[PDB]
């Protein structure tokens, strides 16, 4: 006979949350990845200096002169950050993150410019030789959709 204004408006806010759910869920993940990136960076300094001073990429965190323990460079969504031959990889925690990005990671690696180096940011990579890396293809890479426009670099970016 009457009461449908309360019933529909409680059910439009319910469906509004369902539509606002995936937007906040990738905005959210995309936010948790933007930090793995900040934790990865700022460690470029150590790595850059080590390379320019010696001409060899730092083998591990201790070589680069950073928390000798990968797990000591963690965060809220970051379970750690390891330096492996100049390549700095950031791992996403398992608690406090999206759902399709946890335990997932990215990498920052550089290239000899000769007198200086240039840095790249993208999906996990392994270093082959002092001037070549390759996709650490394995299945734990953070999905392209969660990576900034500034971190879409490919293993062979120059």
């Amino acid at each position: 006979f009457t009461l449908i204004e309360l019933m529909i408006v409680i059910a439009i806010v319910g469906i509004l949350a369902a539509v606002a759910l995936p937007a906040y869920q990738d905005y959210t993940a995309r936010a948790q990845v933007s930090e793995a990136i900040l934790l990865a960076e700022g460690q470029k300094s150590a790595v850059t200096e080590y390379y320019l001073n010696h001409g060899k990429w730092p083998e591990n965190n201790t070589s680069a002169g950073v928390a000798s323990s990968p797990t000591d460079i963690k965060g809220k969504y970051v379970k750690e950050v390891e330096v492996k031959n100049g390549v700095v990889t950031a791992t996403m925690l398992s608690s406090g993150v999206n759902n399709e990005i946890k335990g997932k990671k990215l990498s920052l690696w550089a290239r000899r410019e000769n007198g200086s180096v240039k840095w790249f940011c993208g999906q996990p990579v392994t270093r082959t030789d002092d001037d070549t890396v390759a996709d650490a293809k394995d299945g734990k890479e953070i999905d392209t959709k969660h990576l900034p426009s500034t971190c879409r670099d490919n293993f062979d970016a120059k």
Binding site: F1, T2, L3, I4, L6, M7, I10
Partner: protein, 59 residues
């Protein structure tokens, strides 16, 4: 409908904040007592315009 519209919290109602469908279904009692009232006054208006022998229609 007039005595049942004199406010809220009568005998048998609900509070207005329920969901409408539940409110209307609980009152179904009163919607029913109204229809029966109607059917009755319709019957009176439609109709209207052991001793075995005592039971037979006579003249």
């Amino acid at each position: 409908k007039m005595f049942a519209d004199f406010g809220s919290e009568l005998p048998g109602p609900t509070q207005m904040i329920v969901n409408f469908s539940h409110m209307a279904q609980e009152y179904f009692f009163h919607v029913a007592g109204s229809i029966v009232a109607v059917v009755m006054s319709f019957t009176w208006s439609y109709r209207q315009p052991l001793f075995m022998p005592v039971f037979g229609p006579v003249l």
